[PDB]
Design a protein around this ligand. Structure first.
Ligand SMILES: CCc1cc(-c2n[nH]c(C(=O)O)c2-c2ccc3c(c2)OCO3)c(O)cc1O
Length: 214
């Protein structure tokens, strides 16, 4: 019965990243499906990192040996979750990688979009994670690194994000991205569509990808 207390840290995004987010959110783009390719590619990069780091430190895998990616659509709560057993991120990694630090690609990318370039180019500018906002109104990133506790990052955009120690289900190690889909983007919860886009854009990821249906 005692009330629980939870500490939260709210951070403002870096100015151009915030501009980029408004651009992605309030502009119509037709090839939205590449958001999934970008997430799986981020997961593949993180899996590569724990993989190589373990060659020289097998203990690094005590937090989990499987190196893979799971996709979990949930039609009830309208979320598409992408989980990987990659190296994860510490709290500081989270805060720096997801918002507070300027990326040199942002401006060039925003200018390129203003010129009508395809949103698919986004990964080439180092800000592919933000493509999640093409289909999600809110994004929650839960991550666990061997050197730190499990944290949850969350943002509905609007210029800021929060970080807090995660009270949710523990992960051994890795990063889980939960996309709360916009209502007109529920196609990405359909198994056929997900298989279609993973086959089209991610046929070559070198880690198993498993789609869990129901
Ligand atoms: C939210 C972006 C994202 C990041 C990771 C991830 N986990 N650990 C790490 C790490 O570099 O240590 C990452 C990571 C960090 C930055 C990246 C990245 C993966 O891909 C492009 O930019 C991940 O595994 C999945 C993701 O979707």
């Amino acid at each position: 019965q005692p009330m629980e207390e939870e500490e939260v840290e709210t951070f403002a995004f870096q100015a151009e990243i915030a501009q980029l987010m408004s651009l992605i959110i309030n502009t119509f783009y037709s090839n939205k499906e590449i958001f999934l390719r970008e997430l799986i590619s981020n997961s593949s990069d993180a899996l590569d990192k724990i993989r190589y780091e373990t060659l020289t430190d097998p203990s690094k895998l005590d937090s989990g040996k499987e190196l893979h990616i799971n996709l979990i659509p949930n039609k009830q709560d309208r979320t598409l979750t992408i989980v990987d057993t990659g190296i994860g991120m510490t709290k500081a990694d989270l805060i720096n990688n997801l918002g507070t630090i300027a990326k040199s690609g942002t401006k060039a990318f925003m200018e390129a979009l203003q010129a009508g370039a395809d949103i698919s180019m986004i990964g080439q500018f180092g800000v592919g994670f933000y493509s999640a906002y093409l289909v999600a109104e809110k994004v929650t990133v839960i991550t666990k690194h061997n050197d730190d506790e499990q944290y949850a990052w969350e943002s509905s955009a609007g210029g800021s994000f929060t970080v807090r120690t995660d009270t949710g289900e523990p992960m051994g190690r890795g990063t889980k991205v939960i996309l709360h889909l916009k209502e007109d983007q529920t196609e990405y919860l359909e198994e056929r569509r997900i298989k279609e886009i993973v086959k089209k854009h991610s046929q070559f990821i070198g880690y198993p990808i498993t789609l869990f249906v129901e």
